[PDB]
Amino acid sequence: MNYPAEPFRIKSVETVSMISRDERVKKMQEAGYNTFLLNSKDIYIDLLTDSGTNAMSDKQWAGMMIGDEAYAGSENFYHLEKTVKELFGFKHIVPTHQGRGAENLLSQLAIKPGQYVAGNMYFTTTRFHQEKNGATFVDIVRDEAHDASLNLPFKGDIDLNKLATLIKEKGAENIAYICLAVTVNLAGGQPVSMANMRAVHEMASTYGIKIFYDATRCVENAYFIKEQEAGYENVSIKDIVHEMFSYADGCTMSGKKDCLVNIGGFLCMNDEEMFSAAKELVVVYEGMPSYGGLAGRDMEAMAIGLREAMQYEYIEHRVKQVRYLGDKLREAGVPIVEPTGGHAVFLDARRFCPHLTQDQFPAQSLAASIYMETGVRSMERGIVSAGRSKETGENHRPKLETVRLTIPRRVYTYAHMDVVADGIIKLYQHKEDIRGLTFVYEPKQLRFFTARFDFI
Amino acid sequence: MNYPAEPFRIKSVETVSMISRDERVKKMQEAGYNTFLLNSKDIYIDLLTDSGTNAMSDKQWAGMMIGDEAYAGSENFYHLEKTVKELFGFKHIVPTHQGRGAENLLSQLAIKPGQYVAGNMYFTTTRFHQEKNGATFVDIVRDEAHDASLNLPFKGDIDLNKLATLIKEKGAENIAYICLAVTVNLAGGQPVSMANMRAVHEMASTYGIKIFYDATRCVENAYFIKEQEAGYENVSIKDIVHEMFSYADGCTMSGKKDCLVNIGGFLCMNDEEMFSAAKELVVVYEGMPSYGGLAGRDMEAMAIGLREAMQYEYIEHRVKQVRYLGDKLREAGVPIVEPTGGHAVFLDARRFCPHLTQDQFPAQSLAASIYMETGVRSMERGIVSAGRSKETGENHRPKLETVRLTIPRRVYTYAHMDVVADGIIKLYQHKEDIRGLTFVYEPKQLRFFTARFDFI
Amino acid sequence: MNYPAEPFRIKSVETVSMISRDERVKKMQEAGYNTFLLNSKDIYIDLLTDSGTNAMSDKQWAGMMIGDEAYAGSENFYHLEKTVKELFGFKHIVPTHQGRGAENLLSQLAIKPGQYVAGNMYFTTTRFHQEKNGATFVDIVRDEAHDASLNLPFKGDIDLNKLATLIKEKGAENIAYICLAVTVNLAGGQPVSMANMRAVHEMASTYGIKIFYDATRCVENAYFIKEQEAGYENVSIKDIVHEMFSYADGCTMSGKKDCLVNIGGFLCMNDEEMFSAAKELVVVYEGMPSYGGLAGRDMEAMAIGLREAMQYEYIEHRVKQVRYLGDKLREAGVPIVEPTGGHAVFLDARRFCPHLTQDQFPAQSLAASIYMETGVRSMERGIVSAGRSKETGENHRPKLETVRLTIPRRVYTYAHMDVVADGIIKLYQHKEDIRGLTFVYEPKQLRFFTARFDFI
Amino acid sequence: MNYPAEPFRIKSVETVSMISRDERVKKMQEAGYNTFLLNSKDIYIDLLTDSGTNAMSDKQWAGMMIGDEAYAGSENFYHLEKTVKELFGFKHIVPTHQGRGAENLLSQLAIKPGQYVAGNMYFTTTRFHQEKNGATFVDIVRDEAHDASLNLPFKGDIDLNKLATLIKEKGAENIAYICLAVTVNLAGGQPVSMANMRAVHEMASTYGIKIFYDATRCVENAYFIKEQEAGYENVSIKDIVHEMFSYADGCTMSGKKDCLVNIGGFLCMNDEEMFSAAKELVVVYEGMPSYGGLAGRDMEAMAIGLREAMQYEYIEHRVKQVRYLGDKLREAGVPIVEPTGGHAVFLDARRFCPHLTQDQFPAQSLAASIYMETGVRSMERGIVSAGRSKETGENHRPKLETVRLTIPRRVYTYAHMDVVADGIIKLYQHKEDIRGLTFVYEPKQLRFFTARFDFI
Ligand SMILES: *Cc1c(COP(=O)(O)O)cnc(C)c1O
């Protein structure tokens, strides 16, 4: 019922051009009705992603001025190494320019062809490197996680029965590692309980199976645990995060998310053998282990942001601001995925546009409409992005045809949230007016990135 | 009824420490219950002033990086000179480190001992330099302006009958110049209509009297003209600002206000004789005419800021965010000054605390309570600031005993406004609880700046 | 005989702590006499590498303030794409966090198992990706390039007879592409003449072979052409660079070198098929094609830096400052690699320490001595870095046992060069005093990065 | 004989346009042969002044990012106050936008009409405020200080006999205060010995007279004391500065000089009465005592800069880089003022152009020639700047007809010094070629700032 005011003041702003609706319609047109083809400069509120779109603090910007760009022995690296070792509790750290860079490394080092990798759902880049290195992905998340309507807490929890069964039918020796993600993106940014992580660790530990977290949004997960897990009411975010990682053997992290930066990531591990091997591999892909594809100034900004992310008031507002958007939409009966995750709100384009068939790209059309009416860009996560089968050469028909409204950290206000909520509510009240779309140009690769459409 | 969402995104934020109510009470104690003694770091929302507390843009910060610190011929100066000439339309410009710097200059140049200076109300620093140079200030603002309850538009307007009479009982030749201020600070930030400026210029131009504006908040004034003056509904802010100045002979500007900067100001004029004399005088007070006590980077930032302030959406949201605070307070029956100005909301401490006599400093105590309860700093504008008579050595009893809630530009959100509004409304419901204050230490000079008190 | 003064002024400085010789000796001891283990903060002059250690301009820092961090459609991306298209002349560009990131991409896209890749010498990362993807590297550089004493111009040139013979003995169809590097690192930073680039292109065009440049230091190369190639005396650096690339099908670029930045790189190509395939591949390794693992601000700084690098006076001073260090050392009879390249000076550790056998690591010891005596860090490029055979498990005995003095761009002065030169000349006069080293700890991987030694 | 290398690295550079000699000649022409009219952008090396043209450090730029712009209680002010109290040892400090601002204040507070002000020579701004406030300036520096050819150390010392006599012929009660400047500008930047500061204090103390230091270049002074005063060889710069100020009652400081900043200054004092009165006066001229016309970020940069100036290596290089220029010039027989000061070199235009009469403006023409030949800008300090009498309406004929070459801190290299020294040596060897100048346009005020000339 209550939403907190920003636990910070605005130090500097990014000016935006408020173009008319007539202009937005023309721009949408030229973009082929594909929000991905829109120019950043032509967008008022950009909710395409929460990756690298964060606003830094004055302290981080101060850190950006004292970048020690030395190839080795940089003071910024020591700062990052010390901070991560202190907060995550891992023994070694290898910086990487992004989260995927770390995933490429881990997968090349922890997977042997024909092995299995079990995890609670997946993410495109992380799953790619897994399979790329000869492994078979096995989803062991609870089934309720797949129910977009089920309003249940900790939908990202792993189903221990599915895990135990896997171990039984394939053998511990055949499971490279368990990839536990926090939060679970695919499900809408759903958290994992501390009880589950503890339980999975107990089982895996019994069979000597490795556990690597995809901690890109571990602080948001930390907040849900503090908010909804019994006994964690009075535990600090910092302490919750420390315990979370005490059940993992390492992790891949995208600083571009919860580390409050615009670039940066890293790989963590306790194993010395794996650390030494990782050091040799990072050289050819990211750079020396002393900087890993990151400028010294960026390692400083990331070490600072990680620390800023631990402030309760900051994360509470971050998550509640997303909750605010979901709440407003739910109050008007707009079809969204439940419950609201920590970083975004997903709209059910299917239920939103019942007059359209998935083959008429409702999610893509909804997104286009959202921009023309409010100037906010959202990302289509439906049939268009799902792509079309290689063999049958036909469109994949994903279970969910959604439009994702992803919120960057510390960039928008509740007033901005009202602009997108009011705009979508108005669209919903006249949803029959939303037209279907058709391909006028469909590239072969990355079709969602450059395909152009036209109304049916 | 409707308030616009911020026409910008947050680029960087200023971290703030949220200290408990207990700590705030302790800090206020140590500060002698005087908000002017509180440490900036101990304040959540600082509404002490709108001067130099503005948030700059990414474009301004980029300019901050290309400062041409040359003692002469700096590129930044040319940028500023070109901008001001374009936007204000004046012939010459002399930069100064602050608005007062410009006033000191114009006063030493346009005033002759015994001459008179008429204007709509006054400001401390400006009137000082006026008198300091042997001149008598004559307030020619409409009487209604003095009525804090009269909800009347353009209260800052000049009484043309009060003027004509002045010219009559004293002689044009005895009036140095007319000091028209936009907006009028003393009344609460009230605007002056274009019709008034034009009429004043018509009369003065007749008797050859000089007109110099105090344009510190000329852009807020322009917004009121576009919003409430008939015929300007469709005129651009830029076009309104240009005409405003077409009725003046020069001006003194405080970039710290409407120029969206943290430091800076300038003096403009068309007279070449005055310009040449100004050049000679600036040398000994601010610095060369080519920089006047401002770093190159700051002249660049100010040139950029002035341009940014011309954006309608920006100024509209600026003024409306202040209106929002006023509306919320009025809705709860809190006594405030009417109508709401463009840069601040003034609380009527007299009506707020009817259980306290002015000699118990209601405004001062109201300000201390507001901080201890919400963490927001406000400024007292009553008996404590009015000081005490030199002769009678007794406290001056100002007509209005108010607490000023001044809003910096682009720094806070409506959520922030709700924090100060809900806290003052709650205080009002239990106003009888507010205690009177007493001097435990009263400096002789700048008492309001360092005086310390204690509860009665 | 003449060296030009810096074609720029200092805008900001990086403070350094000048520790004593006693302190430096203690520091060196603690670092196991390995310069790779020294803290950047304990170094006065760091000549470890010219990679990402460059000093940016005020215009570049201004650009760092206007980063459009949008996931797609960023204004900075357009700035970089337009700039590179204009200066390099390639049709398409794909940004990468670094040069290796672009190499990984090109190798995966242009090599098929069993094919051959011919080039003028090689670089560690680039060769790794070549072989990693199933190709056999063939060195076709002129034989003189291997004679470190031969003072001959354009030692980086490709031997057209070696290339023609390759095409003859293996079949044009079996040659993935020709990898022409400018300048040639391994030889000491030696240039490639325009005549050679044109001839190579003529032959390759005949057989339909692909040509991709490893342009990390193409601007330094351009200067040498302007300085020593007949007919280019009056051609602009900008025009020479455009012609160079007119003979290639694409290129991999490390912005960390000649683009005057601390991070960044990119992949260029004219072929649309390859461009489409590269776009799909960059996603999983670097990021969207619209940012490729680089923050928007960095794409802006790299675009600006590339344009700054085209100024003749800047590149002339850059190369000549390196020539200055080499001239001073040569004048004193200190053994170095000839002629001096464009980014570094290589000391011949073998001839420097004739009292030591390569097995006693002369280059590693010379490097430790240079730091203890002057406070400047250099990199060992000899037996330690060469490593030990995997099979025989024995140290590789590289032909050249050197110490590299790599000069960052726009970071040091001639006075700093005098410091390293005078210290090295002094050490040379008592070279017999340099002690041999022995491993006290030899890691299995990246041994030159963390190995620790002790005097013999 | 030996000159130290820069004790810092270049973090960022200010690019410059290297226009040809033909262009420079064209530019000088349009500037009316007056260097004060040249655009900063058309200059290579700007030696107009060392005021506010300094290069800040990466640490200072970091401080610029955390500017606490609160009107009162700013953290940056506490940082500055604490730093000055600690380094200078004074009780109170009142910041001002510039040093003049501090002079204006002190003059108004400590001078009573008719009183006398004695000091070692004078400076324009400071002397003005002295006389403007009804006081007579009495020069009590040693007579040797006026001998531009006398290579005598500590020419800035006060002749104690001249002082004692003053106190005798006028009475201590009639002497406002003693203004001791460190260093002494008018003489060329000459230092005052610690023994003299101690002596003067001992005498003034006896008669209860006041001593205020014009410490704008107190760190350069401190270096000379450490270098040439017996017994201070082993005292830290920090400790020398502390003792220096222990003999004063306060001081006016221009951070634009030795504080390594581009703007800012302050007034120091131990007297509470003066402090309180100073607080009331600053409000109307600079701003609140809590910022005094300075942005929060600038107080931070000044606090950090002051500390950086205390590094022996930095100040030694600073003074020795200027010495280097004087040494090169003297070695070629070029007529300069002796000895070389700590911040500038003065050329003797009279002896430089013996073929010209002061009436033909040799200094002004020399300055013009220096620019057309090298691209460096210098300041005319002869007849043109001396102006012409108000009564007789004729040109004043200053004792010294010089061209001042003032060096900013941390902006140029020795190579830049060679460019100016080599160009001036070449002009000297053909001095007879320097032509006389004649006014083509002479303003009445600030004639040196905008007068235009032409060759006779
Ligand atoms: C964003 C993300 C990653 C890593 O991608 P980044 O761009 O590389 O750093 C990994 N997992 C999840 C669940 C993510 O959301």
Ligand SMILES: *Cc1c(COP(=O)(O)O)cnc(C)c1O
């Ligand atoms: C703030 C203000 C000024 C100028 O003061 P600043 O600090 O000097 O620049 C002048 N007039 C009014 C009405 C003001 O509100």
Ligand SMILES: *Cc1c(COP(=O)(O)O)cnc(C)c1O
């Ligand atoms: C530096 C370099 C590269 C690319 O490496 P970076 O770190 O990745 O960008 C490629 N080739 C040569 C010859 C280089 O010197």
Ligand SMILES: *Cc1c(COP(=O)(O)O)cnc(C)c1O
């Ligand atoms: C520079 C200087 C001052 C002060 O002038 P600034 O511009 O105001 O701060 C005072 N005295 C001397 C001797 C100076 O050199």
